[PDB]
Design a protein around this ligand. Structure first.
Ligand SMILES: Nc1ncnc2c1ncn2[C@@H]1O[C@H](COP(=O)(O)OP(=O)(O)O)[C@@H](O)[C@H]1O
Ligand SMILES: Nc1ncnc2c1ncn2[C@@H]1O[C@H](COP(=O)(O)OP(=O)(O)O)[C@@H](O)[C@H]1O
Ligand SMILES: [Zn+2]
Lengths: 629, 97, 318
């Protein structure tokens, strides 16, 4: 049989690259193969820059230009390397291996795709707009002769169902009538994703171009719709298999539901002559096959302590030790604003959160803190929302009036590509286990105010219309910003008269914060000076005790704790509830206030990294409740 | 034959659901009703389809589930515990109690 | 059918920038037909450059776009002014706000016509990224689409979550709008709010608001009619220098602030506080840094802050 000579040179060069690189002598690729052996992985990663220094690019350019023809030899050399250095990775519980290339020198756009790079190794960038299911693809087929019962195996398939031709070892003559042994055959994961051009590469007036990218193996589901991803792989061409004689009658010679373009009728150049085609004409289209994908656009203490490094672990425990830590944390929140320390403390308590409990009877007790901040304009109420949405994970930002049909809770919309009713997501739904920052909270629609009557307390949304019936989930905290009715706060009317919310909605907010500015000669100078110290030095203007990352780590570490209540804490709690109820006189104070006080005490306890609750914490929570009523 | 979509609670917020086909044999027909939420134990199988290979352009296969067991979960939050296919059914000693 | 500037262009740009009064020349060049209304042209010339833009890690991005709203009596020449500034700017869109889709200025997931597929089409605010977006007939824009502009002028990003796609785009544009009142005249006695039919926050968030007035004055009426008829009678304005100068100032130049600006700015804000919200000072800073980009410089001084405060107080006068 005819063999290749350049392929052999590439095969030995790849083996030498794998065995010899060692540049960090660490044997980085042998380290990777050992890591695969211990972790039972099925894909290897090869960097282009690492290969870009051996043979002065003679191997790298040879691989890049003719990746399609050189891949079989690369896998063959990898098999020998695996056998020589790690036989355990030669068999499964054989592992079909994959090679992933990345860090290519130059990137291409979708509009640079020409037929003269077909078969070459490229990298492309685009925004994903559709993904499909993970279907199984037939890789190594196995059949049995109908008469002999002889077994054939490892029948390669390119683009269509291919059965063997000439029978195995006897005298039997047979051209067809095989039976696939679906159990013995090997399968692989398969996914098709649609991408389009980026917003900047699109010209002033353009209909965006599209492409079909094929993800296979371990690369499935790594690209999600709406994201911006950089793919790398080989540019291939895909024929029309329907006119290549598919076995079944199901294709029925290109059955169609829509009319094809008359403009390209006869203009699309189709080749004829082949016996399999018959008198038909074969057509081609360009698609992409990707091997590597990148994106360019747990409250358990024991497992948490494992991930962090030793320096981080010691720094965290030294941070915990000091007793002033609490006073520091309230200063680290939003270091780009002046004043409003109470707002910072409230935001920190909200981010820390409270414990969620379930009773034996099955009723759920809420553990989310809701905050409402009100005041007259130009009081930096909208800076806190931006800080939270930038710093808090799984947080969303929204306004009172929403343009979307599912404004804040949910909507029912028919399937765009299916025969069922689906459910869209509102801002409350998109914030499960997260903070929702609502701005201009006054101008909400009444059908939404009544709808939020369930999300704040039961943390669910329940709809029942013609199409679908469901009980959705909204376990989200709410940080709301509102303006007084009439334009300006009045310092003799209460919160109720100045605000517009009803007693149902008003009683579901854990904390109310009224922030007021005053026009005096001296404070205005300080505020102006502070706001203008920026815009000359962007970084040295503000200096907090802790950076963003230290605070982000401390919050995650503190949320692992779950405090309990002591014996005297319960007595102090009931005494304070009784005193508050007496002082109210039942119009504004209910059981929900006691539950909120419990939540605030638990959050304050989480702040100090203590697993027991002291009556001082209940006193602090009581003071915080009294300050807002 | 029935089609099972993913439950809205399970689906990540804002993503499209997925669906699969389930074959119900004798003694299991009409147990599940259109609109209910169900849990099915079964066998996951594959089969060759000409249209699927023709449209996609690769030798991909179709999948389907042959149902073995059916459990209703419409309105049930006690699924955290309990054992069996129906927690509202009783045994002889339970009736005697 | 039907960038890469040369060194000689650089030299001529420098020598023209060395002019004694660059402000007034391009004040008159942008709208040759418009007579008087020099102050609104001053504001538009300052807008077309924009203050410097910055995004530091801790505080986050701070805006550097100037928003201008023109309103007043119904038969002035604001629409021609907008169509003038449309052409000068490199990348911009001129679409009226009378109707169209509620997300017509942002992304709208639509079914493709040629193929039964899905295409994500951006709107007019996204398509004006890095430039000036002109809105006409601002008063007819619907109550539901207005909120979209609210997220554009506050966070400069638009998020779309439909058909399984959840993503965010970038607006980063500047809004110049023109509106009309209710009735045939803007009576000065009644305040602005009733006539313009616009929410107080939307009017407030505009950096500069100009009132165009038309009073029956013999001198002004005769002078207007005279040059109008002279234009109809058949018998110092650069053609494309503005576009190249704008591109040079927008793509290479980034000014800074010095303590000379500190001393004037703090005391000016305090003196204005002798009902000026904190928005006012961040409006003065943007205008001063945009003026600094003009009369080509690399740092702000007293002249820029004086011009900015003069402009923002002449705006207050109306
Ligand atoms: N430390 C501060 N104190 C008061 N105001 C500030 C401070 N820092 C920034 N600001 C101003 O507050 C504005 C934030 O918007 P904001 O007043 O919250 O809008 P709204 O009141 O409509 O929600 C910024 O434009 C900024 O100019
Ligand atoms: N100051 C002015 N200079 C030149 N032409 C003017 C002036 N004021 C009004 N006009 C004339 O009046 C008309 C104004 O129409 P336009 O302003 O476009 O309508 P709208 O009021 O809808 O903006 C123009 O045709 C213009 O010739
Ligand atoms: Zn045989």
């Amino acid at each position: 049989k005819v063999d290749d000579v350049t392929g052999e040179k590439v095969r030995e060069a790849f083996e030498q690259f794998l065995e010899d690189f060692s540049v960090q002598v660490e044997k980085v690729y042998r380290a990777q193969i050992e890591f695969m052996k211990i972790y039972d992985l099925n894909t290897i990663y090869i960097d282009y820059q690492h290969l870009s220094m051996r043979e002065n690019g003679a191997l790298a350019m040879a691989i890049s230009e003719q990746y399609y023809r050189f891949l079989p030899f690369l896998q063959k050399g990898l098999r020998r390397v695996v056998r020589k250095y790690a036989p355990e990775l030669l068999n499964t519980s054989e592992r079909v291996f994959q090679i992933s290339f990345f860090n290519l020198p130059t990137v291409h756009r979708i509009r640079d795709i020409r037929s003269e790079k077909i078969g070459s190794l490229l990298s492309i960038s685009g925004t994903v707009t559709r993904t499909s299911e993970v279907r199984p693809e037939l890789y190594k087929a196995s059949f049995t002769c109908d008469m002999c019962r002889a077994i054939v195996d490892n029948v390669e398939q390119s683009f269509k169902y291919t059965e063997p031709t000439f029978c195995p070892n006897p005298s039997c003559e047979n051209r067809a009538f095989w039976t696939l042994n679906v159990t013995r055959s090997r399968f692989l994961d398969w996914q098709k994703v649609r991408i389009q051009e980026n917003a900047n590469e699109i010209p002033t007036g353009s209909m965006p171009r599209t492409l079909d990218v094929i993800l296979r193996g371990d690369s499935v589901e790594r690209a999600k719709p709406g994201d911006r991803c950089k793919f790398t792989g080989v540019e291939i061409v895909v024929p029309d298999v329907t006119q290549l004689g598919l076995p079944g009658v199901k294709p029925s010679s290109t059955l169609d539901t829509r009319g094809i373009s008359k403009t390209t009728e006869g203009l699309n150049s189709g080749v004829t002559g082949l016996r399999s085609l018959g008198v038909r004409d074969l057509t081609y289209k360009i698609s992409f096959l990707a091997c590597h994908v990148i994106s360019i656009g747990e409250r358990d203490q024991e497992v948490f302590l494992n991930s962090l490094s030793s320096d981080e672990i010691n720094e965290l425990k030294e941070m915990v030790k000091d007793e002033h830590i609490y006073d520091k944390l309230v200063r680290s929140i939003a270091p780009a604003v002046f004043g409003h320390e109470a707002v910072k403390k409230g935001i920190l308590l909200q981010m820390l959160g409270g414990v969620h409990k379930s009773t034996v009877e099955g009723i759920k007790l809420r553990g989310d803190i809701n905050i409402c901040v009100v005041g007259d304009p130009s009081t930096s109420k909208s800076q806190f929302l931006k800080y939270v949405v930038g710093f808090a994970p799984r947080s969303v930002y929204t306004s009172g009036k929403a343009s979307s049909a599912a404004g804040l809770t949910a909507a029912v919309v028919r399937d765009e590509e299916g025969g069922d009713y689906t459910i869209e997501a509102g801002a409350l739904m998109l914030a499960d286990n997260g903070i929702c920052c609502i701005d201009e909270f006054d101008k909400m629609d009444i059908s939404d105010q009544v709808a939020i009557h369930e999300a704040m307390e039961q943390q669910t949304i329940s709809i029942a219309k013609a199409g679908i019936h469901a009980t959705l989930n909204a376990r989200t905290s709410i940080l709301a910003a509102a303006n007084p009715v009439g334009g300006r706060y009045n310092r003799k009317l209460s919160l109720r008269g100045n605000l517009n919310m009803t007693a149902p909605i008003m009683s579901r907010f854990d904390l109310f914060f009224v922030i007021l500015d005053d026009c005096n000669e001296k404070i205005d100078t300080e505020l102006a000076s502070h706001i203008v110290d920026l815009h000359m030095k962007r970084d040295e203007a503000i200096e907090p005790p802790f950076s963003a990352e230290q605070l982000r780590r401390y919050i995650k570490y503190a949320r692992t704790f779950k405090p309990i209540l002591t014996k005297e804490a319960r007595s102090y709690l009931v005494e304070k509830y009784k005193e508050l109820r007496k002082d109210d006189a039942s119009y504004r104070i209910t059981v929900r206030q006691l539950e909120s006080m419990i939540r605030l005490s638990e959050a304050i306890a989480r702040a100090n990294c203590v697993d027991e609750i002291t009556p001082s914490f209940i006193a602090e929570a009581y003071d915080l409740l009294r300050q807002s009523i | 034959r029935v089609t099972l979509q993913e439950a809205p609670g399970t689906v990540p917020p804002g993503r499209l659901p997925r669906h699969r086909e389930v074959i119900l044999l004798a003694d299991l027909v009409d147990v599940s009703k259109p609109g209910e939420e169900v849990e099915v134990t079964g066998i996951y199988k594959n089969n060759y389809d000409g249209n699927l290979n023709a449209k996609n352009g690769f030798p991909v296969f179709a999948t389907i589930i042959e149902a073995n067991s059916i459990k209703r979960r419409e309105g049930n939050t006690a699924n955290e515990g309990e054992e069996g296919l129906d927690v509202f059914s009783w045994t002889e000693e339970e009736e005697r109690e | 059918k039907v960038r890469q500037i040369t060194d000689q262009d650089l030299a001529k740009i420098r020598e023209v920038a060395a002019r004694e009064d660059l402000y007034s020349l391009l004040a008159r060049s942008i709208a040759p037909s418009i007579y008087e209304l020099e102050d609104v042209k001053k504001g538009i010339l300052l807008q077309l450059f924009g203050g410097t833009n910055k995004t530091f890690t801790k505080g986050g991005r701070y805006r550097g776009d100037i928003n201008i709203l023109l309103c007043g009596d119904p038969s002035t020449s604001k629409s021609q002014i907008l169509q003038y500034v449309h052409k000068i700017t490199p990348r911009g869109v001129y679409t009226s706000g009378k109707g169209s889709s509620a997300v017509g200025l942002t992304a709208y997931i639509t079914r493709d016509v040629d193929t039964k597929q899905l295409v994500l089409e951006s709107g007019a605010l996204v398509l004006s990224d890095g430039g000036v977006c002109c809105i006409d007939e601002f008063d007819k824009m619907s109550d539901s689409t207005r909120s979209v502009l609210h997220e554009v002028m506050e966070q400069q990003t638009i998020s779309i979550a439909k058909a399984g796609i959840i993503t965010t785009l970038n607006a980063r544009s500047s809004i110049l709008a023109s509106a009309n009142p209710i009735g045939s005249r803007y009576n000065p006695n009644l305040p602005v709010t009733e006539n313009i039919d616009l929410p107080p926050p939307l009017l407030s968030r505009f950096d500069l608001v100009y009132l165009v007035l038309d009073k029956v004055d013999e001198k002004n009426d005769r002078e207007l009619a005279k040059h109008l008829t002279n234009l109809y009678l058949e018998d110092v304005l650069p053609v494309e220098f503005l576009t190249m100068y704008i591109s040079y100032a927008k793509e290479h130049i980034h000014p800074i602030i010095t303590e000379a600006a500190k001393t004037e700015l703090v005391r000016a804000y305090v003196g204005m506080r002798k009902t000026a919200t904190t928005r006012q000072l961040e409006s003065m800073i943007r205008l001063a840094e945009a003026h600094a980009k003009m009369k080509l410089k690399n740092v702000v001084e007293l002249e820029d802050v004086q011009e900015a405060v003069r402009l923002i107080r002449s705006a207050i006068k109306d």
